[PDB]
Design a protein around this nucleic acid. Structure first.
Ligand SMILES: Nc1ncnc2c1ncn2[C@@H]1O[C@H](COP(=O)(O)OP(=O)(O)O)[C@@H](O)[C@H]1O
Ligand SMILES: Nc1ncnc2c1ncn2[C@@H]1O[C@H](COP(=O)(O)OP(=O)(O)O)[C@@H](O)[C@H]1O
Ligand code: ALF
Ligand code: ALF
Ligand code: ALF
Ligand SMILES: [Mg+2]
Ligand SMILES: [Mg+2]
Lengths: 448, 448, 314, 157
DNA sequence: TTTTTTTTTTTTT
């Protein structure tokens, strides 16, 4: 006698919370309905609660008991004793939303079980229905379950939208071409335009071959975010110690030769710039760095939670880098370890609702191709990283692979994957002297 | 005990008929497999019969009995007496197809029952899995049954039926006058004469050197097709943004300077022409644009299928251009990538029964020859493009190479390939200022 | 050990050589003499294989021999499929056994229209456009009647056909009609082998080997088409040779007959050989190589025997 | 999700693990017996101490068993195994340090270190001199803690 | 279950 899956405790908690806190009815109304309660008395009680709320009466023990007695259904549920027990057994109504979600889970699972039972009954007795008929019946039954998935738009915009956009742009060419920055500012006009800033809850993967300025680009983004927001930002520099990272940051901010900074060959003017940068940084105090080695995802999550709770959230998270993270449980298979790391980081980003720039590295096969511009598959263990990543940005430098290149000092940031925006190339001016990236002010090349 | 549905008599009839006629094995083979039989002895017997058939030996009572005995399976299946009973109980093999289909039906019904039971059990015990995991499991399981029963092959076709279909289609064509243009009207007299319009299922290729107006002629053709049909058209502009494509389309339709539209220098007359074109398009709403780059053939196929299903077919598809599509699986081999892209697009055209005009780029070695008129070998990454293409049109502008050209303002569309027609040249008047191609009304040059 | 080895030798190879294995020269000579006396008993015109329907081609090949692989190659637009369908039609009309066509390249409709244009000697453009007069309709009706009388041609336009599927269908047709007179494949590179999909060359080699094995098994000619490489067009002389095949290596090594289609008119607009197509037999196991001239009526999409002056083969 | 009696109990029941942990009665006992979570850090540290002690005992027992039964392994192999086992436990405790605690101290320390490096008037080479003027200029010598890889085809020197 | 290595055969430039 396999009892249908259910949760007496969850239903009791929801009912008690409704008896205690009426204000959270709406949060419960959207999640669950009367039918979702496995036990019929709970269905009756929720129906009466809905009727009282619709009439505007408050939901409490006395009013609910009176209303149920007036309907003669009070005996069917258990009277003042049972309703008082329902109100009593709830630890707190603050978690009524979670109980409602669990009840919805149970209701959906029971619906799936009933659908399976109906399909099995149809299979046992086709009643002259063809195999095609039974398959279509099963598919129709299952599609009811997948109503909460949808597909949204896949790209095809009709002629009317094209005309509207064309007219708007032709008119705004005379006007000011604003960007529309909503996310965390990237500090660069074109990148902000194509990305609308670093979207919260979205996983961003910056990839490049080593020595391409991957860490440099990430640090520049983090510094720009810190100077353009008050919320703290977080960095996990497993690859390098905090000292080198801070030296890079100071060299970029002060626009001074990082070689001088490292060597200590600093003049009075450069020293004054460094002092000003130090003052600005110690004024902000919105940057946090961890020089830990071999961090596991759980440690990163716990530390991020600590910092967010202490400072009421985090503006940005940075990880340097994915392939350094360790999962001793999945050490046997590297690919599974990487996939689990990526999934955990994505879940962390969603839970904290903060942009997360986690760095990644490419397989050598990229350099075997005639064109060395990276693509999505070039990621090492691209199987899972590409799937989990919401935004993927590749860093390329033609000057690196061609000393006679005409694009000297130019770095290409190619958005190769973007769920909520367009892919494409962007150009930036790379000053290796300061290890910095700047908005590209050169002639615009057509994106062909 | 709800026994799974089965038909033992059908199985025995099939086995006896096979024992009585080897020639009807294939009919049974295409309909059922060994695992389909409800009883394991029948599965073993069918497997042994298949093994005998692969060896070419005649399938009979004694041969089957010996084969099973050599595997120690004789007494397991009931001995020689059971096989003799099976052979005796079957009068004839005439209705063997019906019995095989019955066995297939019972096996698939049992499969459906098993899948439903599995889904129900998983719903009962998620084992910590989220709901969506179970829902996707159910969807995949149902899809497996749906795809398993797939006799998706028309098989060998006698010439009589093909002749009848061809004659019916030819008579249908002869019925409705179309001025010789069977496919969607191109809007150009000589091109229609040489091609009878872009026929259904074709993958048309248009190629040209840079700055030759490669996209311009294709856009003019798409405009002519859309204005001359009720079916929708879809344009994959992997090359240029939708804005520029729409601006070029408006310039061609209204014959307004492209520079003015790009710069916004629109006067009352030009603005009125543009407004009329906008009204015409908003009345039509038969044009769809997708500017996403790096698209796989899979994405193009899915997006074309969406339009076909929503709007009851497609009139034309346009792709700008082939060399921008990406196949991640074969990325490291560009030639394999191009072959896959070309073959997949040809299959898409055939499946949708709609012309697919996809553009391509040429090689520089063309410029080194005495005659700059392009041929098939001049294509870049050429191996598969010609071999898959149906109608290949090369755009040639001597004015670009010779400012002393006697054919200024004239562009030659050379038919480098036409499976169902002759080859030759079509001269057209090219208005670069308006970005349009028009029928050439000047002196006629007889082809050599 | 020597005794045990000898004892096992008395079993394994002793039994293997009887039914199979190395055939002693006596049986081979007996079979050869039987075949020779079979030819002796049957007076023929010299075209032992299925008649190609063309004078010089039949002379140089003596008809399409059983069990042999024939590879008709050309650049696209050179009428490879046209010539192949002409050969299929001639074989069907000159024999009673059925023929089977695998038109992976094109749908059955286009191939059938081409065949009707060739047989009725009617313009392809008119048939495609439906601009047919009464005489053309009468010719097409007569051809339809002839074909519906013959009932000896079968077509399959299924895409992604593997060699195993082709073999199964060929066996099915042979059992249905007691064998096959000819098989036509259009074309090789469109066949699929998922096992060797990683290496294209290995896939092509396996396809070629499987088709040759199929031809040997069914004792029927199998004409499979292929496509060349563009390096051919980079040479001064554009006449195709063996090296010009795409995925070349295995194909020639498996082929018994190789015919390259050349059209000087295609590459030379001022060609003096307009309307003349050169079928170059570049490989022939049991005969001489050389060039043959044919008249190509692209309007009717047909190949006919060249009735013009014969040029000495240098 | 919130960690509470009801949600935890149902989560375990979803994996059939509730009755394995003593059930709802045991969970209620656990919830009741704890007065408050103020001293939770001390309890976690105590649990960590006990777990590490058990780990040390297990490693010692394994080493003793291997010594009793080398199974043909030489002494060096057993000593290296013991070395690795002890080093693993030693490294497993590096969880209190190396974290992104309040940045202000870290920034001050890093800036102070940078100032210290500046004050030391080196001749351009702050690390192990490579002995070559241009290489030292481009690299400032072989820096401490840094991994340097010199590569070339064989026979290149 | 993956990264390497490095044969071999092809295509393409
Ligand atoms: N003094 C300098 N002058 C010019 N370029 C420099 C200087 N210092 C560092 N760089 C550049 O900064 C880049 C940073 O390299 P690295 O951080 O290892 O790359 P990634 O973080 O992308 O793996 C190097 O590729 C180097 O060219
Ligand atoms: N109406 C016509 N007039 C003249 N020639 C034609 C006509 N229709 C087709 N052709 C010729 O028939 C040939 C068939 O091409 P195709 O079958 O693609 O060659 P292949 O099969 O060798 O690749 C074309 O090269 C074309 O020149
Ligand atoms: F070499 Al790096 F981030 F500096 F991959
Ligand atoms: F173009 Al083809 F056979 F018709 F190669
Ligand atoms: F690789 Al060597 F001497 F270091 F041959
Ligand atoms: Mg770095
Ligand atoms: Mg062809």
């Amino acid at each position: 006698l396999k009892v249908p899956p259910h949760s007496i405790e969850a239903e009791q908690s929801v009912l008690g919370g409704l008896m205690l806190d009426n204000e959270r009815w709406d949060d419960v109304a959207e999640r669950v309905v009367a039918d979702d309660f496995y036990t019929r008395p709970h269905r009756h009680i929720f129906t009466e609660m809905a009727r009282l709320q619709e009439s505007g009466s408050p939901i409490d023990l006395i009013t609910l008991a009176e209303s149920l007695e007036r309907q003669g259904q009070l005996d069917s549920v258990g009277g003042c004793a049972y309703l008082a027990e329902l109100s009593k057994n709830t630890p707190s109504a603050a978690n009524i939303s979670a109980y409602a979600d669990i009840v919805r889970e149970r209701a959906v699972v029971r619906e799936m079980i009933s659908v399976a039972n109906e399909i099995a009954e149809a299979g046992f007795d086709p009643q002259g229905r063809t195999s095609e008929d039974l398959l279509d019946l099963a598919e129709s039954r299952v599609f009811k379950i997948a109503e909460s998935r949808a597909n949204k738009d896949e790209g095809p915009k009709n002629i009317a939208d094209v005309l509207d956009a064309t007219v708007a742009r032709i008119e705004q060419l005379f006007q000011q071409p604003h960007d529309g920055v909503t996310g965390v500012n990237t500090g660069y006009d074109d990148l902000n335009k194509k990305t609308a800033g670093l979207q919260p809850s979205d996983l961003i993967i910056v990839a490049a071959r080593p020595s391409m300025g991957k860490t440099t680009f990430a640090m520049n983004l983090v510094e720009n975010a810190a100077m353009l927001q008050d919320k703290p930002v977080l960095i996990f520099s497993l690859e390098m110690p905090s000292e080198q990272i801070m030296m890079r940051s100071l060299a970029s901010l002060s626009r001074v030769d990082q070689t001088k900074i490292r060597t200590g060959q600093l003049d009075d003017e450069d020293w004054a710039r460094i002092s000003g940068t130090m003052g600005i940084l110690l004024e902000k105090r919105n940057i946090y760095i961890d020089d830990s080695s071999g961090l596991t995802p759980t440690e990163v999550r716990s530390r991020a939670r600590r910092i967010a709770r202490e400072h009421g959230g985090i503006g940005l998270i940075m990880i340097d880098y994915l392939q350094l993270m360790r999962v001793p449980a999945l050490s046997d298979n590297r690919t599974l370890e990487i996939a689990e790391i990526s999934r955990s980081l994505k879940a962390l980003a969603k839970e904290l609702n903060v942009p997360v720039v986690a760095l990644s590295q490419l397989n050598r096969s990229l350099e075997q191709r005639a064109d060395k511009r990276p693509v999505n598959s070039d990621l090492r263990e691209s199987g899972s990283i590409e799937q989990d990543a919401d935004l993927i940005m590749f860093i390329y430098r033609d000057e690196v692979y061609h000393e006679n290149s005409d694009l000297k000092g130019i770095a290409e940031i190619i958005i190769g994957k973007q769920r909520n925006g367009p892919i494409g190339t962007v150009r930036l001016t790379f000053n290796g002297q300061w290890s910095r990236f700047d908005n590209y002010a050169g002639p615009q090349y057509d994106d062909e």
